Design a protein around this ligand. Sequence first.
Ligand SMILES: CCc1c(-c2csc(N3CCN(Cc4cn(CC(N)=O)nn4)CC3)n2)[nH]c(C)c1C(C)=O
Length: 105
Amino acid sequence: SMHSDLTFCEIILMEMESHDAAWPFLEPVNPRLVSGYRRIIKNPMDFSTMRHRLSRGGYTSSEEFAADALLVFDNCQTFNEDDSEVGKAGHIMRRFFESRWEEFY
Ligand SMILES: CCc1c(-c2csc(N3CCN(Cc4cn(CC(N)=O)nn4)CC3)n2)[nH]c(C)c1C(C)=O
């Protein structure tokens, strides 16, 4: 299970999941709702996957956790136009995360 040294990561993820711009990223990108995603995006990532991985002890380091958070936003800007609703949400959430991360590093 999760080492207590990563509790601050657990809290950042909780706060991201609560954010009103987080809705595109709560669960894996869903083939029932969009086609051609994994055709382009070789490493999908979403907050639920991160939440379960963190809780079961699947992250060793905060940097590994942060890399997955940035992967969410990088995938978003790869697939989505910047002025689309999801594309804008990714930019908001990247700002939100980088701000929380800077409080610690
Ligand atoms: C656009 C796909 C995408 C999502 C995403 C997550 S979730 C979601 N969608 C939720 C369901 N809606 C329709 C709908 C509305 N309602 C409520 C009602 N009042 O009916 N129910 N279904 C359509 C879009 N898209 N995330 C990412 C990162 C994406 C991409 C391409 O990168």
